[PDB]
Design a protein around this ligand. Sequence first.
Ligand SMILES: Nc1ncnc2c1ncn2[C@@H]1O[C@H](COP(=O)(O)OP(=O)(O)NP(=O)(O)O)[C@@H](O)[C@H]1O
Ligand SMILES: Nc1ncnc2c1ncn2[C@@H]1O[C@H](COP(=O)(O)OP(=O)(O)NP(=O)(O)O)[C@@H](O)[C@H]1O
Ligand SMILES: [Mg+2]
Ligand SMILES: [Mg+2]
Lengths: 378, 378
Amino acid sequence: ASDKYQKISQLEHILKRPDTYIGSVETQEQLQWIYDEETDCMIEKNVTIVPGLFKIFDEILVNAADNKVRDPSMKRIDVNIHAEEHTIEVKNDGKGIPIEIHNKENIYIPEMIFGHLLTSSNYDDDEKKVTGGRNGYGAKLCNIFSTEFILETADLNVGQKYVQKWENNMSICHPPKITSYKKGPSYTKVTFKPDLTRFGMKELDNDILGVMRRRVYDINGSVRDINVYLNGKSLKIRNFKNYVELYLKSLEIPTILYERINNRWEVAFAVSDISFQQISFVNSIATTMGGTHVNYITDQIVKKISEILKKSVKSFQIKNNMFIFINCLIENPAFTSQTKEQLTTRVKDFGSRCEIPLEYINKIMKTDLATRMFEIAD
Amino acid sequence: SASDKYQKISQLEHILKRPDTYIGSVETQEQLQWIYDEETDCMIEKNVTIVPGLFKIFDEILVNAADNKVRDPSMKRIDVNIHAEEHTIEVKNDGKGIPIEIHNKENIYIPEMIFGHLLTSSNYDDDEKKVTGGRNGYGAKLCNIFSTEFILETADLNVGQKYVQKWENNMSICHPPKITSYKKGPSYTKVTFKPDLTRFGMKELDNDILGVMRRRVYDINGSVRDINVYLNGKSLKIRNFKNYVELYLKSLIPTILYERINNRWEVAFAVSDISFQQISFVNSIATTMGGTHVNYITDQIVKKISEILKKVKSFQIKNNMFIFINCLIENPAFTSQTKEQLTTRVKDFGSRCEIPLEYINKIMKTDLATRMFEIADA
Ligand SMILES: Nc1ncnc2c1ncn2[C@@H]1O[C@H](COP(=O)(O)OP(=O)(O)NP(=O)(O)O)[C@@H](O)[C@H]1O
Ligand SMILES: Nc1ncnc2c1ncn2[C@@H]1O[C@H](COP(=O)(O)OP(=O)(O)NP(=O)(O)O)[C@@H](O)[C@H]1O
Ligand SMILES: [Mg+2]
Ligand SMILES: [Mg+2]
């Protein structure tokens, strides 16, 4: 009976069952937005991508964005994708990783938080934080799903440079090379080579490159006060309104209605062609499966439109003519999984509210939505 | 401070600190839930306030018992006894028990191993295509971890012994098993737990959680073939999925249209009053957030209706449907440990489910058709 039952390690379970950590490691046929460089705008495309591969990139991206929360003096993210060499680099400025041996773990802190599961600066929820990072997995998950993983950082308090290489799904950990550093700014650079074989791929194809690239545009659109560079090119999205307007050409009384509701909430609206559509971000994370924040906003808009039509029309008819954009900040958010695709935090625990002004719903009532809704009623 | 800022925690510590991706929220949630009304012998939808994590730890034990029918098709009986006043919950199943044997690798008794250590399972070899609900080797331990007291009792006829082992204080206390001679009796497994109500923000099991727990036991009777289920000694009476779906009749040409499509798929249909509704089961797991199996079935029905209608938008057809699905899926994958949403691709199901024209024609005899013709004319 012994063979019937097995005990496995945390690390073994991640490699065996990637789904709850990074999403599927199988190819998925998806309708995805990508940024078209020739038309300088968003295009919806049928792609085939491996979610887990996109997600290990996303983990490093959101970590960089989180450092802007930790250090508001940070000014730039650099993303460099070397397709041919399957190598991806993510660099941020502002404060680096402290080059110190940890009191308890007795290893260098960078080795600790990039090379050991369940390590985080986000474990003390006494503090209400608007970082995306929550559970102490993201960076290690990337490491685990890489043939090679390199952490480079510079710390000004100690005046040192720190380079550490992991290999073979985080199973090989080389000692760090630490050198002297009085060379300008602090920074962190993460350089990884995904285990493409683990994702059933031989190379980075145009589909995955397209969505990776677009995700970088997302970061620029959702995070304020940073410059975002992709393969050397400054993306120069000035704000979330500018980001949403990248979708303008494809969608085509304004086509997009944008409003900043408060310091933690921005929303945009457009009329949807076939069914309900949403693009939303919580603390820079792309909530592709929506959740409590999306529902909080849409419910308000649908509720009011229903009242207007009443003085015949079911709520679903209203909702399915809506394309909503949301950029929001939520305190200590909770999600259905590590992939953080769906927010579960109750509204009352958001740390803020977003009461959509009646005048904004009035503007929605001038769009094609109302004409469609008055045809069903009358 | 840097040592205080960055923390390493154990897997056990993480589960208790951050329950969400393991068992769901430990905060109260307002939910619309189906309840079994005993006075009117039917399902009724009620607004309830429950703690999802508490409901979930109960569900893990229920699904484990259901899984034993796959292991041993001769299993006939599940008893669920809720002693509200004592907040003790018991789940007992007959058929083959847990082997009372020292594991050849782990060097401890198998029950101690698979109920008292994380990441232990008989479901880690996916070379076998199984239709068990169990996948990750967490479920039983999660219940234990969120219990003040957790008792496994089992009888094993191969060694002719009975085994009783008690854990206390969130699995932190593991008492040695009591093993006794057991001759001339049936095999069985009985799990008895007292949920750590302090960790769920509760003092007692109120009517809302009891109602939802009891309904979940009806689900099990409805979804598991050829078993008899009891709640506090009282037979649940239903024998199959058709019977189960019929419990919803009073709330909902027949009102409900049911068909077994094959040995792994049953589907029932009713006209929905407000919007799209689904009740679905994968390997006896309640997939309350739907997923690929639900989409597979509904896409077909929608596509087939749409083709006949034009001889209207897809969401208009979809949202007049109430779909019931009971299916068996090979080695399923889900968004999280809570298994609310199936992600397995259709091609990986291990079977197919083509909805026949006869079934579609019968749907076209219901209110859905005349509602669609109303939209078509205008
Ligand atoms: N670019 C960066 N700059 C500074 N600190 C970083 C950076 N990336 C990661 N860290 C630190 O490393 C820790 C581990 O990162 P990570 O593994 O992604 O976990 P996390 O972000 O805290 N939580 P999660 O991403 O939800 O699993 C983080 O808590 C940060 O404190
Ligand atoms: N009532 C039962 N009868 C027989 N075997 C059981 C029973 N309950 C649990 N087990 C066994 O104990 C193991 C551990 O259970 P569990 O922790 O729930 O993991 P799992 O069911 O395999 N996977 P998961 O529930 O998805 O985390 C299972 O693999 C079963 O083999
Ligand atoms: Mg992170
Ligand atoms: Mg289980």
